[PDB]
Amino acid sequence: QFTDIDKLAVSTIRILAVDTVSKANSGHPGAPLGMAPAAHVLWSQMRMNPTNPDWINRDRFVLSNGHAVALLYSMLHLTGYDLSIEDLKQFRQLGSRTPGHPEFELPGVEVTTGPLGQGISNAVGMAMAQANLAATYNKPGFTLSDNYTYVFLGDGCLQEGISSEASSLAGHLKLGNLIAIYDDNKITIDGATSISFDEDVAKRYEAYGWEVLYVENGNEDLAGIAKAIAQAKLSKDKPTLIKMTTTIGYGSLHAGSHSVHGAPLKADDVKQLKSKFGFNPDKSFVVPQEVYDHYQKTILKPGVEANNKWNKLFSEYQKKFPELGAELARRLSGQLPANWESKLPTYTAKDSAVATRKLSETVLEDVYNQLPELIGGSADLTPSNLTRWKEALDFQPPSSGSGNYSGRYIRYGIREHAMGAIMNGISAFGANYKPYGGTFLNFVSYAAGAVRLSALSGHPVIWVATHDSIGVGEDGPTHQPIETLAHFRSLPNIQVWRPADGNEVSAAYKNSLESKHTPSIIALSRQNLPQLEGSSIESASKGGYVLQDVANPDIILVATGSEVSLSVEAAKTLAAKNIKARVVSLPDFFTFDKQPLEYRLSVLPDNVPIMSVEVLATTCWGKYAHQSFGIDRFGASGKAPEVFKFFGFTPEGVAERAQKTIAFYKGDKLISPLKKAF
Amino acid sequence: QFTDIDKLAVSTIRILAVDTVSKANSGHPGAPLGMAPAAHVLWSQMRMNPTNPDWINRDRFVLSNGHAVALLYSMLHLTGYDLSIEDLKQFRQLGSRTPGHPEFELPGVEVTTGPLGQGISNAVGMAMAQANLAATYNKPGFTLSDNYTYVFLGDGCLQEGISSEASSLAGHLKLGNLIAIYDDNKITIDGATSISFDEDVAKRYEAYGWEVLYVENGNEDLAGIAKAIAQAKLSKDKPTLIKMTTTIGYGSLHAGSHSVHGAPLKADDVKQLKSKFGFNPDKSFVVPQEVYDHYQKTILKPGVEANNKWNKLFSEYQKKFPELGAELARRLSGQLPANWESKLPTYTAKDSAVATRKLSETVLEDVYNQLPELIGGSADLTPSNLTRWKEALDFQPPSSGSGNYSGRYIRYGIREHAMGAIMNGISAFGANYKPYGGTFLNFVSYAAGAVRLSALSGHPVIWVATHDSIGVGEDGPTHQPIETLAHFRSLPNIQVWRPADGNEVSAAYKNSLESKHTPSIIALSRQNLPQLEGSSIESASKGGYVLQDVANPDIILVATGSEVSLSVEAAKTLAAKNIKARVVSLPDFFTFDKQPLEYRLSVLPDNVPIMSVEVLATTCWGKYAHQSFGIDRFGASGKAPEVFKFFGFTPEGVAERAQKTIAFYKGDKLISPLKKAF
Ligand SMILES: CC1=C(CCOP(=O)(O)OP(=O)(O)O)S/C(=C(/O)CO)N1Cc1cnc(C)nc1N
Ligand SMILES: CC1=C(CCOP(=O)(O)OP(=O)(O)O)S/C(=C(/O)CO)N1Cc1cnc(C)nc1N
Ligand SMILES: [Ca+2]
Ligand SMILES: [Ca+2]
């Protein structure tokens, strides 16, 4: 039952968003105006604490149509979050807390959106995390977890393939606490949706197993919107999509036109809009006191009290369940178990040779019990990635018969992109969730859109990327990575691990799991590799180190993964020719670059030629080596050993190129590629 | 009406594919065994010429579930293509004509598949190309174009978001000559589809506007498969999907199990399989003469005659329609109009400043009439990319009211990945089709899966990627490319143009359009840039050149796009300090690298420090410069000019770093980064 104060709040939201966009003379007024009614109704019935944006059991909201951020900033301010009118007055300005698209860093913003399709996919992950948390910690009389996951999205998100992947999986998973509101306004940047998007959205979502509800007049029907949301909560066995029809830019002289999608409304348009809603056309950023009072009473105080009651319930829970209570308390503090790394496998040169793919499997087997927050999965490559521990229980709806929500292994299906965004959502949920997902390194590229946000937002997600090179063999070039590592090494804030042996694999996992703000891609091989003499978790955790040292080397061979052992063998060939080669292992560029310059230079000093060895593109190696031996063309379908030889990657081949490099620089003064002039 | 010979052909296909996989001791026997009946029926009614795989009006077949390639190689051999049993006996071996996944290079293989979801998307493009060719050249009594586009796909392709994008668009486009057969075998690598994929596929496709037919017993129902295909052809207004249920690995002792998906069948399993079908369990690669005879009579001879009648029809067409006939003849020869480049815009330092985004629009406007094979489009960013010429007619179904199939502008919607694969399909169709698609550079990354195949297969598609950097301004970091260029510059066989001004933009388009085997990404800016003194189409067409020369320079400033003008201004600042700077423009790494070493060294010689300037990652610049001034962190939301200054990109900022570089190397012997030791 909504009254005049509710209508006033809606007008306030609409005008505040418009003023925000107008002052910036940049931004999108359309969707904010169209979705204001829904924002008011939804937020007014959400259980959250504006004074504690991190409350674990808060209902969560995701703006998948991120360009409509002026609406989110308006809601954040109006409902009590730490965002002021001045912040809104700095919308889209260098260094403000109000960037042109929602950023994870801001309190109240659950994830970074802007790239269409990501938000809704993130929400699927949030709902999955909630389901697991509840199934793992809830007890009779102690409902610690039961929040809802709300999402706003438009035609753009519905067209991006990632949302189809995520929605198909969400339907299979029967995520009944996931509720999405679709802004059905029939407009996109190119004009009417009919010119490129006339599918039956409702029918498609029902096909995924979603319940689809409708709100014919999303422009004014507050009760209808409220009723749809209420109904969505009743279908606990199906995620729900609410097709809410609205007029983009409602209120504007050009409402319903693509022109109001992403350009500020003209001054006179804003004036008539305000007058129309009973506001002074000559005033801006106006918030009637009655509106603040209303939200204080309907959202803020009730939210603070809900959080209060929850803290009381959790306090008692820890007394009732000391172990589970301490476990969750630890997770909420964002810390892994003390000395958890002690369970990471260690090796010596005496141990047998193992593929890093298998070594990875062993690490997972040795730490999954120690890390209850660890949630794994694979994009339909479980037997190939070796990402599922022996007695794992799959994350599935109870009715499946293949597992339940307390399960910790996700069957993502052939959906890399959605897996990437879902992991971001699981990570964003909190409670120290540590999601990891497996697939072939070459197909991690299918999820670049999501991986980029993992890096930008700082979601510590982990990609277990096996079959890292031509070592794949027979499957051929369409399956053999060449540009993949160079790509992500060029992406800020992402670890790109390529472990050479057992100890390096443990270091990769150690650093990846302890990471709080940096995602990780761990590139693994399927071919067997020997346990290197000189490797250790401690040294490899530095991203780069001297594996095999020698006094006054004639050359330094810097390599990664499978090529480190190759370089060690090449060193033997060189030694047989009275040539000294120091071998450097560079497990991770990112981690290495984080070390002090002093250390990095001790690894890659001046006065000695440095040649890199890695069976992938050489484009990214200029930062560490003078010359590079790699592959800058596509692969080949053939037995792995034969393919390596085809490309010249044999001990002799490396040694020969080392000799050429030595002769090439004889008599020259060499400077470490690490030294910069500014 | 199929008889015993047809059943024998199916058994021959099944066993040949199995033997092929077994000899390689690598590969996938599952789908080939399951889809053999459909392959026989489909191919037996396809109008194609095995003796001329390039016949423009041939019905086309795409194996979207590429891992099932043993089936395709079997069909190619059995039906008369230039592929021998020996070729099959070299399946998955280094250098053979039969790699582990289908490659575009092989005659009879329409596109490269293996990465799931690409094939079906490519097919959508092929059908679109056919529709346009027919609408453009067909005349009363002269039906030059009317072929069908057939596709085989499995659960894997249906799960990848790219196929949803492509299928949604295909439905909107009412592509009635597109017919897809879905291998509904309920199995994927992780096991039963029910664990991650239980959506209602039929309902979803009907929601897109596709007609969905069924074949309950795809293991034996030859007539049913034939009837489904016949029915599909009757619905000229809807693409058709045939849900054909089969048993994966039909015939194997382990049929129906995930174990037969991608591992050769054991020796004894193969033996019982052969005995079961009436073949000798001790013989391999057996083709009964009656089978060759049957295909000679039902496919090869009829195909040769159909191609013959078509050649006769086209010869008469050329006499009837001299102009249109010569036009199509030219296109079929794969050549652009003689001296077509004469229509490319040219500029001088006297012309006004223009954003390369706008310059691009002008090129398109000046050549679309000259190039009838040019087909453009945008992923819902037409007004932003400026990719649509003034009097263009959109490619749409006749019933749309927005255009028809003769239209040359595609409204791709927010579907970058599908746009990438669809352009590949349009390019692959032939008739010299030149598709180009626009979107923001940062979202080209959403289509990496397809772009990679553009490079691997060698489809000369063109991406008009606007808003190339922080110059984007207010939209912020989620929209500002940092790693994008570095990523694709690390990918073999792809041009990554970043034109600095008017002449460079024309050079970019000249090289991109004349390209026969290399795709292109043209990175464009939105900010205005001046017409450079020293630029020209001829010079820029070399990928790299000396824009502003000077005798005995103290430093060389090498830059791209918007940073070239910045470096020119920086040179003025340096000159004011009695410092000489030569300015080099590097529009395209790929094209530059193609030039003779002699030329490249003349542009980037020894004995002089070289500093690169580009507002993106520096990770890829080690190949050309000693020091690099770029951005290796994410962007910021703010007015463009302010963002540039924040990152220090002003004439003074570049000049200062140039001075640091000069001092850093004073007294040292410098070698061009271009010189290699091997
Ligand atoms: C294509 C596109 C938009 C479409 C707007 O349609 P919508 O239906 O989602 O909403 P409205 O109803 O509000 O128009 S908003 C937008 C941006 O770049 C803006 O962020 N873009 C470019 C864009 C392209 N591709 C991706 C992955 N993300 C994007 N943001
Ligand atoms: C996941 C996967 C396959 C699933 C097979 O399921 P399917 O239902 O399409 O067919 P079957 O019925 O024949 O099993 S086959 C396959 C490969 O790597 C093989 O090419 N892969 C790994 C893979 C992952 N992701 C992408 C984009 N492409 C791939 N090829
Ligand atoms: Ca819309
Ligand atoms: Ca299948």
Coordinates of all heavy atoms in Angstrom, one line a residue, chain B residues 125 128-129 331 364 371-378 389 408 410 412 419-438 454 459-464 509 512-513 515 518-520 522:
Chain B
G125 N 26.2 -16.5 -40.7 CA 26.8 -15.5 -41.6 C 26.7 -16.0 -43.0 O 26.5 -15.2 -43.9
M128 N 23.3 -15.4 -44.3 CA 23.1 -14.0 -44.5 C 23.7 -13.6 -45.9 O 23.1 -12.8 -46.6 CB 23.7 -13.2 -43.4 CG 22.9 -13.3 -42.0 SD 23.7 -12.6 -40.6 CE 23.8 -10.9 -41.0
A129 N 24.9 -14.1 -46.1 CA 25.6 -13.8 -47.3 C 24.8 -14.3 -48.5 O 24.7 -13.6 -49.6 CB 27.0 -14.4 -47.3
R331 N 33.9 -10.2 -58.6 CA 33.9 -10.6 -57.2 C 34.3 -12.1 -57.1 O 35.0 -12.5 -56.2 CB 32.5 -10.4 -56.6 CG 32.2 -8.9 -56.4 CD 30.8 -8.7 -55.9 NE 30.6 -9.4 -54.6 CZ 29.5 -9.2 -53.8 NH1 28.6 -8.3 -54.2 NH2 29.4 -9.8 -52.7
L364 N 34.1 5.2 -45.5 CA 33.0 4.3 -45.8 C 32.0 4.9 -46.7 O 31.6 4.3 -47.7 CB 32.3 3.9 -44.5 CG 33.1 3.1 -43.5 CD1 32.4 2.8 -42.2 CD2 33.5 1.8 -44.1
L371 N 32.5 -0.3 -53.8 CA 32.6 -1.7 -53.4 C 31.3 -2.4 -53.0 O 30.9 -2.4 -51.9 CB 33.6 -1.8 -52.2 CG 34.9 -1.1 -52.4 CD1 35.7 -1.2 -51.1 CD2 35.7 -1.7 -53.5
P372 N 30.6 -3.0 -54.0 CA 29.3 -3.6 -53.8 C 29.4 -4.8 -52.8 O 28.4 -5.1 -52.2 CB 28.9 -4.1 -55.2 CG 30.2 -4.2 -55.9 CD 31.0 -3.0 -55.4
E373 N 30.6 -5.4 -52.7 CA 30.8 -6.5 -51.7 C 31.0 -6.0 -50.3 O 31.1 -6.9 -49.4 CB 32.0 -7.3 -52.2 CG 33.3 -6.5 -52.3 CD 33.6 -6.2 -53.8 OE1 32.9 -5.4 -54.4 OE2 34.6 -6.7 -54.3
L374 N 31.1 -4.7 -50.1 CA 31.3 -4.2 -48.7 C 29.9 -4.3 -47.9 O 28.9 -3.8 -48.4 CB 31.7 -2.7 -48.8 CG 32.1 -2.1 -47.5 CD1 33.4 -2.6 -47.0 CD2 32.2 -0.6 -47.7
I375 N 30.0 -5.0 -46.8 CA 28.8 -5.2 -46.0 C 29.2 -4.7 -44.5 O 30.0 -5.4 -43.9 CB 28.3 -6.6 -45.9 CG1 28.1 -7.2 -47.3 CG2 27.1 -6.8 -45.1 CD1 26.9 -6.5 -48.0
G376 N 28.6 -3.6 -44.1 CA 28.9 -3.1 -42.8 C 27.9 -3.4 -41.7 O 26.9 -4.1 -41.9
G377 N 28.2 -2.9 -40.5 CA 27.3 -3.1 -39.4 C 27.9 -2.7 -38.1 O 29.0 -2.3 -38.0
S378 N 27.1 -2.8 -37.0 CA 27.6 -2.4 -35.7 C 26.8 -3.2 -34.6 O 25.7 -3.6 -34.8 CB 27.3 -0.9 -35.4 OG 27.8 -0.5 -34.1
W389 N 26.7 4.4 -43.7 CA 26.7 5.5 -44.7 C 25.3 6.1 -44.9 O 24.3 5.4 -44.6 CB 27.3 5.0 -46.1 CG 26.6 3.8 -46.7 CD1 25.6 3.8 -47.5 CD2 27.0 2.5 -46.6 NE1 25.3 2.6 -48.0 CE2 26.2 1.7 -47.4 CE3 28.0 1.8 -45.9 CZ2 26.3 0.3 -47.5 CZ3 28.1 0.4 -46.0 CH2 27.2 -0.3 -46.8
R408 N 22.7 -3.6 -47.1 CA 24.2 -3.9 -46.9 C 24.6 -3.4 -45.5 O 25.8 -3.4 -45.2 CB 25.0 -3.2 -47.9 CG 24.7 -3.7 -49.4 CD 25.4 -2.8 -50.4 NE 26.8 -2.7 -50.2 CZ 27.6 -1.8 -50.8 NH1 27.1 -1.0 -51.7 NH2 28.9 -1.8 -50.6
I410 N 24.1 -4.2 -41.4 CA 23.6 -5.2 -40.4 C 23.5 -4.6 -39.0 O 24.4 -4.1 -38.4 CB 24.4 -6.4 -40.3 CG1 24.5 -7.1 -41.7 CG2 23.9 -7.4 -39.3 CD1 25.6 -8.1 -41.9
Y412 N 23.5 -5.7 -35.7 CA 23.9 -6.9 -34.9 C 23.4 -6.9 -33.5 O 23.3 -8.0 -32.9 CB 25.4 -7.0 -34.9 CG 26.1 -7.5 -36.1 CD1 26.7 -6.6 -37.0 CD2 26.1 -8.9 -36.5 CE1 27.4 -7.1 -38.2 CE2 26.7 -9.3 -37.6 CZ 27.4 -8.4 -38.5 OH 28.0 -8.9 -39.6
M419 N 28.8 -11.3 -33.8 CA 29.2 -10.5 -34.9 C 30.5 -10.9 -35.5 O 30.7 -11.0 -36.7 CB 29.2 -9.0 -34.4 CG 29.6 -8.0 -35.6 SD 29.4 -6.3 -35.1 CE 30.9 -6.0 -34.1
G420 N 31.5 -11.2 -34.6 CA 32.8 -11.7 -35.0 C 32.7 -13.0 -35.9 O 33.3 -13.0 -36.9
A421 N 31.9 -13.9 -35.4 CA 31.8 -15.2 -36.1 C 30.9 -15.1 -37.3 O 31.1 -15.8 -38.3 CB 31.2 -16.3 -35.1
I422 N 29.9 -14.2 -37.3 CA 29.1 -14.0 -38.4 C 29.9 -13.4 -39.5 O 29.7 -13.7 -40.7 CB 27.8 -13.2 -38.1 CG1 26.9 -14.0 -37.2 CG2 27.1 -12.7 -39.3 CD1 25.7 -13.3 -36.6
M423 N 30.7 -12.4 -39.2 CA 31.6 -11.8 -40.2 C 32.5 -12.9 -40.8 O 32.7 -12.9 -42.1 CB 32.4 -10.6 -39.7 CG 31.6 -9.4 -39.3 SD 32.6 -7.9 -39.1 CE 33.6 -8.4 -37.6
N424 N 33.0 -13.8 -40.0 CA 33.8 -14.8 -40.5 C 33.1 -15.7 -41.5 O 33.6 -16.1 -42.6 CB 34.3 -15.7 -39.4 CG 35.5 -15.1 -38.6 OD1 36.1 -14.2 -39.0 ND2 35.7 -15.6 -37.4
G425 N 31.8 -15.9 -41.2 CA 30.9 -16.7 -42.1 C 30.6 -16.0 -43.4 O 30.6 -16.7 -44.5
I426 N 30.4 -14.7 -43.3 CA 30.1 -13.9 -44.5 C 31.3 -13.9 -45.4 O 31.3 -14.1 -46.6 CB 29.7 -12.5 -44.1 CG1 28.4 -12.5 -43.3 CG2 29.7 -11.6 -45.3 CD1 27.9 -11.2 -42.8
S427 N 32.5 -13.7 -44.8 CA 33.8 -13.7 -45.5 C 34.0 -15.1 -46.1 O 34.4 -15.2 -47.3 CB 34.9 -13.4 -44.5 OG 36.2 -13.3 -45.1
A428 N 33.8 -16.1 -45.4 CA 34.0 -17.5 -45.8 C 33.1 -17.9 -47.0 O 33.4 -18.7 -47.8 CB 33.8 -18.5 -44.7
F429 N 31.9 -17.2 -47.1 CA 31.0 -17.5 -48.2 C 31.6 -17.4 -49.5 O 31.4 -18.2 -50.4 CB 29.7 -16.6 -48.1 CG 28.7 -16.9 -49.2 CD1 27.8 -17.9 -49.1 CD2 28.8 -16.1 -50.3 CE1 26.9 -18.1 -50.1 CE2 27.9 -16.4 -51.4 CZ 26.9 -17.4 -51.3
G430 N 32.4 -16.3 -49.7 CA 33.0 -16.0 -51.0 C 32.5 -14.8 -51.6 O 32.0 -13.9 -51.0
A431 N 32.5 -14.8 -53.0 CA 32.0 -13.7 -53.8 C 32.7 -12.4 -53.3 O 32.1 -11.3 -53.3 CB 30.5 -13.6 -53.7
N432 N 33.9 -12.5 -52.8 CA 34.7 -11.4 -52.3 C 34.0 -10.5 -51.2 O 34.3 -9.3 -51.1 CB 35.2 -10.5 -53.4 CG 36.5 -9.8 -53.1 OD1 37.4 -10.4 -52.7 ND2 36.6 -8.5 -53.4
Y433 N 33.0 -11.1 -50.5 CA 32.3 -10.3 -49.5 C 33.3 -9.7 -48.5 O 34.3 -10.4 -48.1 CB 31.3 -11.2 -48.7 CG 29.9 -11.2 -49.3 CD1 29.4 -12.3 -49.9 CD2 29.1 -10.1 -49.2 CE1 28.2 -12.3 -50.5 CE2 27.8 -10.1 -49.8 CZ 27.4 -11.2 -50.5 OH 26.2 -11.2 -51.1
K434 N 33.1 -8.4 -48.2 CA 34.0 -7.7 -47.3 C 33.2 -7.2 -46.1 O 32.7 -6.0 -46.1 CB 34.6 -6.5 -48.0 CG 35.6 -6.9 -49.1 CD 36.8 -7.7 -48.5 CE 37.9 -7.9 -49.5 NZ 39.1 -8.6 -48.9
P435 N 33.0 -8.0 -45.1 CA 32.2 -7.5 -43.9 C 33.1 -6.8 -43.0 O 34.2 -7.0 -42.8 CB 31.7 -8.8 -43.3 CG 32.8 -9.8 -43.6 CD 33.2 -9.5 -45.0
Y436 N 32.4 -5.8 -42.3 CA 33.1 -5.0 -41.3 C 32.1 -4.8 -40.2 O 30.9 -4.7 -40.5 CB 33.7 -3.6 -41.8 CG 32.7 -2.6 -42.2 CD1 32.1 -1.8 -41.2 CD2 32.3 -2.3 -43.5 CE1 31.2 -0.8 -41.5 CE2 31.4 -1.3 -43.9 CZ 30.9 -0.5 -42.9 OH 30.0 0.5 -43.2
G437 N 32.6 -4.7 -39.0 CA 31.6 -4.5 -37.9 C 32.2 -3.6 -36.8 O 33.4 -3.6 -36.5
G438 N 31.3 -2.7 -36.3 CA 31.8 -1.7 -35.4 C 31.3 -2.0 -33.9 O 30.3 -2.6 -33.7
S454 N 39.5 -15.8 -36.9 CA 39.7 -14.9 -38.1 C 41.1 -14.9 -38.4 O 41.5 -15.0 -39.6 CB 39.2 -13.5 -37.7 OG 37.9 -13.4 -37.3
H459 N 40.5 -15.1 -42.3 CA 39.3 -14.4 -42.9 C 39.6 -12.9 -42.7 O 39.8 -12.4 -41.6 CB 38.0 -14.7 -42.1 CG 37.7 -16.2 -42.0 ND1 37.5 -17.0 -43.1 CD2 37.4 -17.0 -40.9 CE1 37.1 -18.2 -42.7 NE2 37.1 -18.2 -41.4
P460 N 39.7 -12.2 -43.8 CA 40.0 -10.8 -43.8 C 38.9 -9.8 -43.3 O 38.7 -8.8 -43.9 CB 40.5 -10.5 -45.2 CG 39.6 -11.4 -46.0 CD 39.7 -12.7 -45.2
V461 N 38.2 -10.2 -42.2 CA 37.2 -9.4 -41.7 C 37.8 -8.1 -41.1 O 38.9 -8.1 -40.7 CB 36.3 -10.1 -40.6 CG1 35.8 -11.4 -41.2 CG2 37.2 -10.4 -39.4
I462 N 36.9 -7.1 -41.0 CA 37.4 -5.8 -40.4 C 36.6 -5.3 -39.2 O 35.3 -5.2 -39.3 CB 37.3 -4.7 -41.5 CG1 38.2 -5.1 -42.7 CG2 37.7 -3.4 -40.9 CD1 38.0 -4.3 -43.9
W463 N 37.3 -5.0 -38.1 CA 36.6 -4.5 -36.9 C 36.8 -3.0 -36.9 O 38.0 -2.5 -36.8 CB 37.2 -5.1 -35.7 CG 36.7 -6.5 -35.5 CD1 37.2 -7.6 -36.1 CD2 35.7 -7.0 -34.6 NE1 36.5 -8.8 -35.7 CE2 35.6 -8.4 -34.7 CE3 34.9 -6.4 -33.6 CZ2 34.8 -9.2 -34.0 CZ3 34.0 -7.1 -32.9 CH2 34.0 -8.5 -33.1
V464 N 35.8 -2.2 -36.9 CA 35.9 -0.8 -36.8 C 35.7 -0.5 -35.3 O 34.6 -0.4 -34.8 CB 34.8 -0.1 -37.6 CG1 35.0 1.5 -37.6 CG2 34.8 -0.6 -39.0
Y509 N 42.4 1.4 -44.2 CA 41.3 0.8 -44.9 C 41.8 0.2 -46.2 O 41.3 -0.8 -46.7 CB 40.2 1.8 -45.2 CG 39.1 1.9 -44.1 CD1 39.1 2.9 -43.2 CD2 38.2 0.9 -44.0 CE1 38.2 2.9 -42.1 CE2 37.2 0.9 -43.0 CZ 37.2 1.9 -42.0 OH 36.3 1.9 -41.0
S512 N 43.5 -3.0 -45.2 CA 42.5 -4.0 -44.7 C 41.6 -4.6 -45.8 O 41.4 -5.8 -45.8 CB 41.7 -3.3 -43.6 OG 42.5 -2.9 -42.5
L513 N 41.1 -3.7 -46.7 CA 40.3 -4.2 -47.7 C 41.0 -5.0 -48.8 O 40.4 -6.0 -49.3 CB 39.5 -3.0 -48.4 CG 38.5 -2.4 -47.4 CD1 38.0 -1.1 -47.9 CD2 37.3 -3.4 -47.3
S515 N 43.5 -6.9 -48.2 CA 43.9 -8.1 -47.6 C 43.1 -9.3 -48.0 O 41.9 -9.2 -48.0 CB 43.9 -7.9 -46.0 OG 44.2 -9.1 -45.4
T518 N 44.3 -11.9 -44.1 CA 44.5 -11.4 -42.7 C 43.5 -10.4 -42.2 O 43.2 -9.4 -42.9 CB 45.9 -10.7 -42.7 OG1 46.9 -11.6 -43.0 CG2 46.1 -10.1 -41.3
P519 N 42.8 -10.7 -41.1 CA 41.8 -9.9 -40.5 C 42.4 -8.5 -40.0 O 43.6 -8.4 -40.0 CB 41.2 -10.7 -39.4 CG 42.4 -11.5 -38.9 CD 43.1 -11.9 -40.2
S520 N 41.6 -7.6 -39.7 CA 42.0 -6.3 -39.2 C 41.2 -5.7 -38.2 O 39.9 -5.8 -38.2 CB 42.1 -5.4 -40.4 OG 42.3 -4.0 -40.0
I522 N 40.7 -1.9 -36.7 CA 41.1 -0.5 -36.8 C 40.7 0.3 -35.6 O 39.5 0.5 -35.4 CB 40.5 0.1 -38.1 CG1 40.9 -0.8 -39.3 CG2 40.9 1.5 -38.3 CD1 40.2 -0.4 -40.6

